[PDB]
Design an enzyme around this catalytic site. Sequence first.
Site, PDB file in Angstrom:
ATOM      1  N   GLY A   1      31.613  42.788 -42.103  1.00 20.50           N
ATOM      2  CA  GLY A   1      30.605  42.113 -41.270  1.00 20.50           C
ATOM      3  C   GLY A   1      29.414  41.677 -42.135  1.00 20.50           C
TER       4      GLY A   1
ATOM      5  N   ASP B   1      27.617  57.014 -49.252  1.00 22.13           N
ATOM      6  CA  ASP B   1      27.553  55.751 -49.994  1.00 22.13           C
ATOM      7  C   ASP B   1      26.252  55.484 -50.736  1.00 22.13           C
ATOM      8  OD1 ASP B   1      29.039  53.447 -50.839  1.00 22.13           O
ATOM      9  OD2 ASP B   1      27.879  52.234 -49.402  1.00 22.13           O
TER      10      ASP B   1
END
Length: 263
Positions: A29, A135
Amino acid sequence: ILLLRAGLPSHFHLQLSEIEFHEIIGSFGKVYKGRCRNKIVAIKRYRSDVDMFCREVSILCQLNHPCVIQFVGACLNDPSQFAIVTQYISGGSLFSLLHEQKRILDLQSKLIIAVDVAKGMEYLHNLTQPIIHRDLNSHNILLYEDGHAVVADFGESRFLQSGNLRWMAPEVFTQCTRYTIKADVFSYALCLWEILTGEIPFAHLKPAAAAADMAYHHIRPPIGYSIPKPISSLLIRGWNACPEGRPEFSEVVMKLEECLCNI
Ligand SMILES: CNS(=O)(=O)c1cccc(Nc2cc(Nc3ccc(C(F)(F)F)cc3)ncn2)c1
């Protein structure tokens, strides 16, 4: 999606019509700069998809710390409209500063960044129900103009949980263990090295080659003699193959603030 509507406090409920999309800033996205309830905001919009979005919102709506990206709301109406809205930080990513704009920073500015990141991560790890960022990299450390930093992008984040091994291969033994908050400290450590040297870890290698070398061949980036002792200590411990041997962030914070007192 229905359980999330109930649990998520109603003030975080946004309608897509309340968000004004301006410019793309990242491209899973797309992430837009934009505007929502008279705030300048960053908006992450999406392409198992639902569950992932639901986790992320549940994680985000718990967070409140000035070294963690501030959550504004999300859109729930339906999966075609799924979107996450946070504050927008004008000074950009640490990655951009270091490697694109190649700006030279002094030791005090670097440590300030390192400390705020460590402070955001100490917060995540010491919640009643701890959160692993999973992350953490220089793309997800964003920067105010004044030089302070915040940890962003909880897209991979997770809440922490609560054969015979003598002949198992190392990778299989590691597959079986299950990761902890310490995975973050390793990431942090590379980040800290990245800040001091100004270099992407293993710049000459591709991501997967870097990961391989670190995990299999046990390689870490070169620690020059010019790196101050308290720091190279954090580096050496922080990226230990044995997770149990990495410091807690509370300590990482304690040592770096101690360095600021001598900078
Ligand atoms: C939706 N929030 S999030 O935490 O999930 C998330 C996920 C992925 C990326 C971001 N990025 C940003 C970037 C930002 N500031 C920014 C300032 C300047 C530039 C310029 F240099 F290109 F112009 C670019 C960006 N502020 C907030 N989030 C956020």
